[PDB]
Design a protein around this ligand. Structure first.
Ligand SMILES: [Mg+2]
Ligand SMILES: [Mg+2]
Lengths: 579, 571
């Protein structure tokens, strides 16, 4: 709202180039003032004409020429912010700052949004914020400052003409105040619509395989076309709403500038005003009427910049999970839960209710249970996905909240259920866990995950490009690449969540070989519905409806009839399809 | 090929109307300046009389000028909105009609860039330049004639100013050549990096600790900023010169010095000079608004070239015979397939097998064998290099897309949910489906129990990829979505993964009770599913190595014996 807040937002958004932006705007303002002065030089020049006084005609023509030269050089230098790389540098710095904020925002709240919606902010909102600042500044300074200076100098030439020329600038204020809420609402609505459309388009692209199956012409794509038509109707309605206001503003401005000339003509025929000064004023007005009529329309870009700044600051206002009473590196790696009860956002589940457990160091523990029990919740809260409302989780004797996210992510290496590969080469996909590793170490990690076989069968070798989500690889190959990625990173705690869902029996045994090798010197947490792989665990934790119902080892759990025994019987139970 | 002229074809009538009204407004503005110059001349000749008729002429011409300008701008804006809608709809339809492999390779970030940002860039051009183009082509052409009729020497001077500006602008043309490809690739890579950063945040935070934010995102940002700096430097001179040569000050400077020279030569006419000064805004100041948006118009031109490059991609050879299947039986005849990426060997070498209707065919083999490959080829993901895939005797190539997809209900290996509602996700492709059918389909699977447990029930919201829902729960939702269709062949790609054995057994028994005569294609690594099936097909290294029942393949003593023995020893 307040222009001071808008100014400080713009300065913050520009960042290190704030002084360059201020200097460029000062140059543009000086150029507008000097252009107004140059127009003011017409009054003696036209008075020099009609009389033939060549000496002072040249004397004032030199002044006009130097004024025009200063105006041209000032505008050329002030517009360099767009073309000398300062705008690009500011955009790059803003993108870097926004990207870092993505790295620090709580992951739970971030997952409540959409990737396409965030794409419209880090990419589109930035260009709406910065790409038109210099141009809009140049247009508004030309629109207002130059005619203002011309009228102020007319006041020196003729106080009656100057006063009536100046009387239009107060007239623009009520129209601007009347039209500002409409422009603000229109810009906000268009921004929200564009963000929603970006999210919908990204989701539509990411699910073309599912969409093609349903068929029936277009059903979800029918919703996409409905969104397109709704955007068209929104834009058309907004334009129609402001068309009458724009017509009224243009009429009022251009006819208030058409009564200045009439008053000057009346004064001239009355004999109290010089005809040459009248011609100079008329030339100024005719060269000023068109830009001044649509000054309010020009303020729409300022409203757009303000809306982009507001969206960017709202995104940047998200606070990270507090790091209270910062501590040092834990020396043991025995994860302990203590009365942990976690509730998901917008979820009444109260999952992981009053859960207390222990993950001994230099051992391997397993989590079993039904789908939705809360094992992935345990894995996520161990990575500080969200703060527990009750209970404490400690890597060693140190609570997670006493650590910064960097340290915790350094102590944790995870194979995720949702296997995610990066859109680059396989070598870099494995190496991102620990880039400062020897190629022999990378090959050893690949061998441990039993993935060198199909890497050898890759014509591009390790340089084979991986598509979005690692599409070019199979599910098992991608999952083994993720396993190798986690293996390459040397972390005290290794959390694997269903490591072998998409692996065959031989590949799964080969992977379990390295998993068992990991046990001796690393804390290992393993999630598995294939109970055969995790039968050898030192401890097995049974989860049901967010509670750890039963504890024990493979022999101990199978000795007493419980949920683990029932799960093993179901796994061993034959499956009948009846033809 | 004039891309700017090409894009306005769907809204050509309205664009031409805007051009015509802008030209009419320009001519009316010239008339206003002529009437006002006549008023000044009358005042000069008679310093005691009001030029009432010329003043009425100038005020009326001013009124018509701004009315026509505003109406033309409104027409241009409506045409721009209509063109944006048409282009976005055409892009969405092309994306639907594009082959799945081509669209997957091009990327979701590229789709977001072309569909949203490139179409958005059309607004600047269509709604804010075509009236300005019309003004810049109308005012100078009439103004030069008017000034030659008025005073040919000042006309020559101002025409020389305009010619100097135009010649300098034409000489300095970057042409946007040999760098459009890099500009695009940088733009879509930045978009894809942002999307990848957002959707893979747990992996980024866990592993990518080397760089603040995300490393690939940083690399893309640096490439984009290099491209932007190069583009801005290459276009700086033309833009800044057009901003200083089309300013009123150069024209006024030349006119004033020419008038002084004429006074020195004893041939200066005051009224003609005044009328030239009033009318001189039409030659060089008319092109000024267009050059204020020339750079954004160049960006729009690049985006237009990208859009029309996207629309120029080949489709998946749709036929016109429209033959129908009548058997619901699958046949692979010596099919060989290579993915667009030039992988060594082949995904499939000589695959050939017949699955008659009603058969519970189970697909087994090690990872990378090509089970998902044959499933995708059945789904018309691409076309086989050799052989033929047929459903009910008729080839897939000899089918309409609707005809082929009315045959197969497919459960993908990757479980994707379109956010939205669980009930909406299950009823995808048919919003009119009653909730009773959705609940029945979820009861065929095991999703209904956990769905009822959720507080909003079926109307529970799920994340962009289904992140608000468990992996096993997400797969159950996808299974229910496929089952709601009731299509003749049901293909599953590891549908019982991410699930505990109790849920797996319940799903198997319920689905066996459900797909009684339906042909069921099964991809499963858990061999407990395939121990009782109508036929088992084993793939290894892209070759169909074995085919038969569990007993048959066990007695054969081949690749299936080792797999089954290892699986049984494990459990
Ligand atoms: Mg999970
Ligand atoms: Mg697969």
């Amino acid at each position: 709202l307040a222009w001071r807040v808008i100014w400080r937002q713009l300065i913050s958004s520009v960042g290190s180039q704030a002084r360059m932006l201020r200097r460029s705007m000062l140059a543009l303002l000086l150029a507008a003032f000097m252009q107004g002065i140059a127009f003011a030089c017409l009054y003696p020049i036209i008075d020099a004409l009609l009389r033939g006084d060549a000496p002072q005609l040249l004397n004032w023509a030199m002044a006009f020429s130097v004024a025009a030269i200063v105006t041209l050089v000032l505008r050329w230098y002030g517009l360099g912010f767009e073309y000398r790389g300062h705008l690009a540098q500011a955009t790059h710095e803003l993108r870097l700052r926004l990207g870092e904020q993505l790295r620090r925002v709580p992951l739970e709240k971030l997952q409540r949004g959409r990737a396409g919606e965030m794409n419209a902010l880090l990419l589109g909102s930035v260009d709406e914020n910065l790409n038109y600042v210099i141009a809009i500044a140049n247009i508004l300074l030309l629109t207002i400052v130059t005619p203002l200076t011309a009228s102020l100098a007319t006041l020196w030439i003729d106080w009656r003409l100057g006063l009536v020329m100046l009387l239009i600038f107060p007239l623009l204020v009520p129209f601007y105040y009347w039209r500002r809420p409409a422009m603000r609402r229109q810009m906000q609505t268009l921004g929200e619509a564009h963000q929603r459309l970006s999210g919908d388009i990204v989701e539509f692209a990411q699910g073309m395989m599912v969409l093609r199956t349903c068929g029936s012409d277009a059903d979800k794509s029918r919703a996409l076309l409905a969104h397109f038509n709704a955007l068209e109707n929104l834009q058309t309605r907004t334009h129609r709403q402001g068309a009458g206001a724009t017509m009224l503003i243009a009429s009022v401005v251009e006819l208030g500038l058409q009564v200045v000339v009439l008053s000057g003509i009346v004064w001239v025929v009355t004999g109290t005003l010089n005809l040459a000064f009248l011609i100079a004023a008329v030339a100024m007005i005719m060269r000023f009427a068109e830009p001044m009529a649509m000054f309010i329309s020009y303020t729409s870009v300022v409203e757009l910049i303000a809306s982009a700044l507001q969206r960017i600051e709202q995104f940047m206002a998200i606070a990270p999970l507090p790091v209270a009473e910062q501590s040092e590196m834990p020396e043991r790696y025995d994860i302990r839960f203590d009365n942990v009860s976690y509730r998901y956002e917008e979820g009444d589940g109260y999952a992981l209710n009053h859960v207390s457990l222990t993950f001994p160091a230099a051992s391997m523990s397993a989590l079993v249970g039904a789908s939705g029990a809360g094992k992935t919740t345990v894995t996520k809260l161990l990575m500080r996905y969200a703060d527990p409302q009750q209970g404490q989780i400690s890597i060693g004797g140190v609570d997670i909240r006493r650590l910064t996210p960097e340290q915790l992510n350094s102590l944790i290496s995870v194979v995720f259920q949702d296997v995610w590969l990066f859109d680059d080469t396989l070598l870099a996909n494995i190496r991102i866990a620990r880039p400062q590793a020897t190629r022999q170490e990378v090959e050893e990690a690949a061998r441990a995950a039993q993935c060198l076989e199909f890497i050898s069968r890759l014509p591009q070798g390790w340089l084979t490009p991986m598509g979005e989500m690692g599409g070019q690889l199979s599910g098992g190959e991608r999952q083994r690449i993720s396993i190798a990625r986690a293996l390459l990173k040397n972390a005290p705690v290794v959390i694997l969540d269903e490591p072998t869902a998409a692996l065959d029996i031989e590949s799964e045994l080969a992977v379990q070989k390295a998993i068992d090798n990991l046990v001796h010197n690393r804390t290992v947490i393993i999630i598995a519905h294939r109970l055969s792989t995790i039968a050898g665990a030192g401890n097995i934790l049974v989860m049901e409806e967010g509670q750890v119902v039963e504890q024990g080892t493979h022999a101990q759990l199978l000795s007493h009839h419980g949920r683990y025994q029932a799960l093993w019987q179901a796994q061993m139970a034959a499956r009948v399809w009846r033809d | 090929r004039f891309p700017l002229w090409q894009v306005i074809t769907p809204v050509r009538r309205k664009v031409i109307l805007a051009m015509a009204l802008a030209g009419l407004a320009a001519l009316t503005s010239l008339g206003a300046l002529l009437f006002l110059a006549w008023s000044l001349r009358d005042i000069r000749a008679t310093p005691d009389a009001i030029p009432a008729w010329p003043l009425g002429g100038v005020i009326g011409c001013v009124v018509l000028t701004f009315v026509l300008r505003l109406q033309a701008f409104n027409t241009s804006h409506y045409a721009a909105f209509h063109l944006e809608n048409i282009l976005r709809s055409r892009l969405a339809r092309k994306a639907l009609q594009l082959p799945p492999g081509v669209l997957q390779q091009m990327g979701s970030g590229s789709v977001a860039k072309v569909m949203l940002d490139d179409v958005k860039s059309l607004h600047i051009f269509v709604a804010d330049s075509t009236p300005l183009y019309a003004r810049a082509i109308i005012m100078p052409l009439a103004t030069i004639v008017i000034l030659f009729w008025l005073d040919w020497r000042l006309a020559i001077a101002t025409l020389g100013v305009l010619a100097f500006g135009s010649v300098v602008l034409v000489l300095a043309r970057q042409r946007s050549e040999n760098m459009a490809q890099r500009y695009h690739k940088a733009r879509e890579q930045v978009s894809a990096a942002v999307i990848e950063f957002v959707q893979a945040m747990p992996v980024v935070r866990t592993f990518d600790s080397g760089s603040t934010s995300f490393l690939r995102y940083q690399r893309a940002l640096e490439e984009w900023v290099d491209v932007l700096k190069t583009w801005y430097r290459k276009a700086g001179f033309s833009a800044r010169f057009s901003f200083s040569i089309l300013n009123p000050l150069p024209t006024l400077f030349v006119l004033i010095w020419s008038g002084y020279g004429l006074l020195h030569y004893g041939s200066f006419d005051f009224i003609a000079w005044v009328a030239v000064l009033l009318l001189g805004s039409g030659m060089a100041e008319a092109v000024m608004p267009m050059m204020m948006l020339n750079n954004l118009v160049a960006q729009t031109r690049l985006s237009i070239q990208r859009i029309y490059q996207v629309l120029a991609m080949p489709e998946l050879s749709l036929p016109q015979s429209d033959q129908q299947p009548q058997e619901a039986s699958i046949t692979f005849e010596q099919v060989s397939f290579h993915y667009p990426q030039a992988r060594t060997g082949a995904a499939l070498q000589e695959v050939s097998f017949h699955v008659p209707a009603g058969q519970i065919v189970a697909l087994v083999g090690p990872s990378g064998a090509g089970k998902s490959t044959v499933a995708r080829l059945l789904l018309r993901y691409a076309d086989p290099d050799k052989g033929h895939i047929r459903i009910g005797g008729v080839d897939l190539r000899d089918m309409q897309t609707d005809t082929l997809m009315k045959q197969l209900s497919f459960v993908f290996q990757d479980n994707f949910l379109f956010a939205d509602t669980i009930a909406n996700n299950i009823r995808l492709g048919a919003p009119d489906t009653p909730l009773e059918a959705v609940i029945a389909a979820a009861r065929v699977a095991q999703a209904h129990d956990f769905i009822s447990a959720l507080p909003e029930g079926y109307n529970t919201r799920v994340g962009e990829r289904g992140v608000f829902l468990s992996g096993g729960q997400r797969q159950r939702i996808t299974i229910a979505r496929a089952l709601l269709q009731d299509r003749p062949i049901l293909v599953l790609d590891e549908a019982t993964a991410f699930a505990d054995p109790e849920n797996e057994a319940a799903l198997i028994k319920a689905l066996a009770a459900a797909m009684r005569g339906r042909t069921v294609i099964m991809v499963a690594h858990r061999l407990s599913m395939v121990t009782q099936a109508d036929v088992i097909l084993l793939f290894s290294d892209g070759q169909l190595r074995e085919m038969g029942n569990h007993t048959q393949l066990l007695a054969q003593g081949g690749l299936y014996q080792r797999l089954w023995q290892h699986y049984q020893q494990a459990q």
